[PDB]
Design a protein around this ligand. Structure first.
Ligand SMILES: CC(C)[C@H](N)C(=O)NS(=O)(=O)NC[C@H]1O[C@@H](n2cnc3c(N)ncnc32)[C@H](O)[C@@H]1O
Length: 862
RNA sequence: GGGCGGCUAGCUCAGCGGAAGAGCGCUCGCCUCACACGCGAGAGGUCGUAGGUUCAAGUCCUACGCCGCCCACCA
């Protein structure tokens, strides 16, 4: 230890960070010690980490460390996620911001550049976590696209397919013509945008009219019906007729359908299954054959599409499309409108739609496999309000498109016969085998799906792929049901649920026993922190400015009840300042036991007090950790250390130390140990440095959690008496306008036994000598247990003392009033505890007694 | 259209059935021999509104008001 005046994290953290980095806390399946498991949610290989991740891992670490030194086999599986779609976009940008882009350089040369990036980003992420003191079993670091994990998916898919659950068809898919790939619902964002709602109208067979309101005019040529609510009899004479479509000679039918909202536009809508999910739905509800007018490049093409209108852009197609309507006479009324325009969550461009042969996953069945558990009580949720939010999600699931036309992810394991057009999917038993002949036509010619999987598809395979489940390892046997899943609600759907499936379906058991959902950190502005918003702060920018133990402490302190966390640097100071206080407290004890000269070993009230107040602390804090309420523990230990140890105990001990008392110097050292223990999970660095200098131990992390010792009833009540006498006096001086160090005489009445037995402490703390005889005239301070009288010697600020006391009375009678009203209240007398009632009575007893002392003094004073 | 979270001291946030709290800021004193990233003494809240339950309500029930999320096929 190098005990300077102020604590410099930079002289401590880095050396320990490295010591822990180079020598991980490796897990042992045969440790024959109760395990505790946590799967770290793998950070996306896109850039660095931000304060969010920090909150996330900081919480995890604190649990790992606690559990570890609590007696378990702390297993925290680290790892990074390839991000798929994400990383893709990221590397593309780096490229273009150079000159060339994706297509510009093959599917190889590019797939290369992405890995180089996977290294930078994946590497940086690891440092960051190491520097934040992550005691993660880096021996088992995993990576979504490493051999051991790529096997987890490939097998997972195989079992799915050959099980039926994973199929291939042409359901409708949300497609982004930017990235050229299908997305999933959860992957697209519908952000309200100003547009135009056009009402077109056209010829009915025999009769003459039908009117429709569509945001996209171009999608008319691909119509297959006009839908009208079932009960909207305003169309009763149009129901079942026809409709030449504008510019066409195509005659669409007029059908009913519950999905038509009569009150929107005209009571009827156009139906275009090949270009929209609502129409596709209604479409395939009256069996309407799909038909497209625009291709994946987002351009015009099709049978219906009219000459000269086929070709150019999807939008530059509706402009000229409208003019050909009104000027042709079918465009009735156009008008502004705020449309719920769907865009690609990761590139912005508005998604299109298309029927494509893709890989889907019968979610309906799986989802229930999970609900079975939740329903039973298998999984626990911390905020707990998320149980429902989860279940209700699974309640209404929709077959998930697993395919992706991206160049990143896992090349799916499916082979297509260039002859009988059949799919060849390796079986479980030989999942690793690449078919060489079609099991349909027996042909040798085969072609493998060039698609890729959804990053979210592999990620749902984590509580398994980190334990080598592609196979059947010992890790997976020793610790599969994870103990607590830490993550922020932002991915409770695309991860937590997805994983609950893999777990209940591939293992028939909860992937984890408790799901811990913490809020999200967000810029001061109140909005979420994320690479996308461009509102991110590197955790290392903060660590270098306040220190890792600080950053860790802020973040935990603030993570209360799964609530979000608004960025407020003030909280980072809060933390730093506290580290420093903890530090100083330690410096004092270290510098104290310096050249100490033992001269007695006498138990001191102050000692017996802090020991007791400590058990109280250990008990409380443990239970808090036991309830996964770290944020609370954080402020409960702040309390202990600062307000009970530094503010009162250390001070109360200085005289005894000058007096060369060993029992005290001892107690200080012992109490400081336990405290360093308690604080460790949150502030690991400083807490270790200190503990080593204090006891020689080089790995506090491995020490055992403290157990509450005794608890001294009287002692605690005795020392409170003291605290009061001391504060009374220093409150008097304050009011009198007397300087702090000013020598002073005082007289005490009441529970004074404590002050008498521990004179020197009283003196040292109040800076006052005790008067044997009560002074006639004097300034008075009335405290609950004790009362203080200060002689009128010197120049005192009576106006102040007056005001202050004229104000305590204004309050003591007020308190007496409330109590009276209670005690004499209907029902309160007996309908309340035989305790809260007799005590609320002992409040009245003394609120008066004090009000009296003050009243008398207050008036007595000339 | 549904759900949810928030609304407590100037600011940022805890508390969530029995006498209103923290950090910072502010006022007054202090370089008191661990700490000025500090010490001591104070000021500052009818706990978003309207009801209701209960001996007892920021703390529970009920509508509502704003701020923000998530989910949904109003073309
Ligand atoms: C499979 C998933 C783990 C995926 N690779 C992924 O979620 N990758 S990530 O970079 O977004 N990291 C997400 C994890 O970090 C948390 N997180 C991300 N942003 C924040 C934030 N602003 N506040 C609090 N927590 C946040 C998520 O809870 C998740 O654990």
């Amino acid at each position: 230890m190098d005990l300077p005046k102020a604590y410099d994290p930079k002289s401590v953290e880095p050396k320990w960070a490295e010591k822990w980095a180079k020598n991980p806390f490796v897990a042992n399946p045969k440790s024959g010690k109760p395990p505790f498991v946590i799967f770290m949610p793998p950070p996306n290989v896109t850039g660095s980490l931000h304060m969010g991740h920090a909150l996330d891992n900081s919480l995890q670490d604190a649990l790992i460390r606690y559990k570890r030194m609590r007696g378990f086999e702390a297993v925290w599986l680290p790892g990074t996620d390839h991000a798929g779609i994400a990383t893709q976009v990221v590397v593309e940008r780096l490229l273009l911001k150079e000159g060339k882009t994706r297509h510009d350089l093959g599917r190889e040369k590019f797939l290369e550049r992405v890995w180089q990036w996977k290294e930078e980003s994946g590497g940086t992420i690891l440092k960051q976590l190491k520097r934040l003191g992550a005691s993660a079993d880096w021996s088992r670091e995993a990576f979504t696209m490493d051999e051991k994990r790529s096997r987890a998916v490939r097998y997972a898919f195989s079992r799915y397919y050959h099980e039926g659950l994973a199929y291939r068809a042409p359901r409708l898919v949300n497609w982004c013509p930017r990235c050229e790939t299908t997305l999933s619902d959860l992957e697209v964002e519908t952000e309200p945008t100003p547009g135009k709602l056009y009402t077109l109208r056209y010829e009915v067979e025999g009769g003459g009219f039908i009117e429709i309101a569509t945001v996209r005019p171009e999608t008319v040529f691909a119509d297959q019906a006009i839908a009208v609510h079932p009960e909207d009899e305003r169309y009763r004479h149009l129901l079942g007729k026809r409709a030449r479509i504008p510019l066409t000679e195509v005659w669409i039918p007029i059908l009913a359908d519950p999905a038509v909202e009569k009150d929107f536009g005209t009571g009827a809508l156009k139906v275009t299954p090949a270009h929209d999910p609502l129409d596709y739905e209604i479409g395939e509800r009256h069996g309407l054959k799909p038909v497209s007018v625009i291709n994946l490049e987002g351009r015009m093409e099709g049978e219906r599409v009219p000459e000269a209108l086929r070709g150019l852009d999807r939008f530059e197609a509706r402009r000229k499309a409208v003019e050909l309507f009104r000027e042709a006479g079918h465009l009735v009324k156009e008008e502004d409108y705020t449309i719920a325009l769907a865009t690609c969550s990761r590139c912005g461009t508005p998604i299109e739609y298309a029927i494509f042969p893709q890989w889907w996953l019968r979610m309906r069945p799986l989802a229930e496999e999970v609900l079975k558990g939740l329903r039973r009580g298998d999984i626990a949720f911390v905020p707990e309000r998320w149980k429902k939010v989860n279940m209700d999600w699974l309640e209404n699931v929709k077959d998930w498109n697993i395919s992706r036309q991206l160049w990143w992810g896992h090349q799916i394991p499916a082979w297509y016969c260039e002859d009988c057009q059949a799919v060849n999917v390796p079986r479980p038993e030989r999942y690793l085998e690449d078919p060489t002949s079609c099991e349909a036509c027996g042909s040798p010619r085969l072609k493998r799906d060039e698609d890729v999987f959804d990053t979210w598809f592999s990620s749902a395979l984590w509580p398994l792929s980190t334990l080598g489940w592609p196979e059947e390892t010992e890790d997976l046997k020793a610790f599969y049901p994870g103990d607590v899943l830490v993550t922020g609600y932002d991915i409770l759907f695309l991860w937590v649920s997805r994983m609950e499936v893999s777990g209940y379906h591939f293992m028939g058991e909860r992937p984890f026993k408790t799901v811990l959902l913490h809020g999200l950190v967000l810029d001061e502005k109140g909005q979420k922190m994320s690479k996308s918003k461009g509102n991110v702060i590197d955790p290392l920018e903060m660590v270098e400015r306040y220190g890792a133990d600080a950053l860790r402490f802020a973040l935990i302190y603030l993570a209360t009840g799964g609530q979000d966390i608004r960025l407020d640097l003030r909280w980072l100071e809060m933390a730093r300042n506290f580290a420093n206080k903890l530090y100083n407290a330690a410096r004092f004890v270290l510098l104290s036991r310096e050249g100490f000269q033992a001269k007695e070993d006498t138990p001191t009230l102050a000692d017996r007090f802090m020991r007791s107040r400590l058990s109280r602390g250990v008990e409380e804090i443990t239970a808090l950790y036991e309830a996964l309420d770290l944020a609370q523990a954080a402020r409960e230990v702040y309390e202990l250390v600062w307000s009970e140890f530094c503010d009162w105990y250390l001070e109360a001990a200085k005289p005894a130390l000058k007096a060369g008392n060993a029992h005290t110097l001892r107690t200080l050292e012992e109490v400081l140990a336990v405290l360093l223990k308690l604080l460790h999970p949150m502030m690991p660095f400083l807490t270790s440095e200190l503990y080593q200098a204090l006891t020689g131990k080089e790995e506090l992390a491995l020490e055992a959690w403290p157990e509450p010792g005794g608890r001294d009833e009287e002692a605690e009540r005795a020392f409170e008496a003291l605290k009061q006498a001391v504060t009374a006096v220093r409150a008097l001086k304050a009011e009198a306008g007397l300087p702090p160090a000013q020598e002073v005489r005082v007289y005490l009445e009441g529970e004074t036994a404590p002050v008498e037995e521990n004179l020197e402490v009283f003196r040292f703390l109040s800076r006052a000598d005790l008067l044997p005889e009560r002074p006639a005239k004097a300034l008075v301070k009335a405290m609950p247990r004790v009362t203080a009288r200060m002689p009128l010697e010197g120049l005192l600020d009576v106006e102040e003392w007056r005001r202050r006391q004229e104000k305590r009375l204004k309050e003591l009678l007020a308190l007496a009033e409330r109590s009276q009203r209670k005690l004499a209240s209907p029902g309160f007398r007996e309908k309340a505890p035989k305790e809260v009632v007799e005590a609320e009575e002992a409040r009245l007893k003394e609120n008066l007694e004090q009000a009296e002392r003050i009243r008398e003094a207050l008036s007595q004073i000339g």
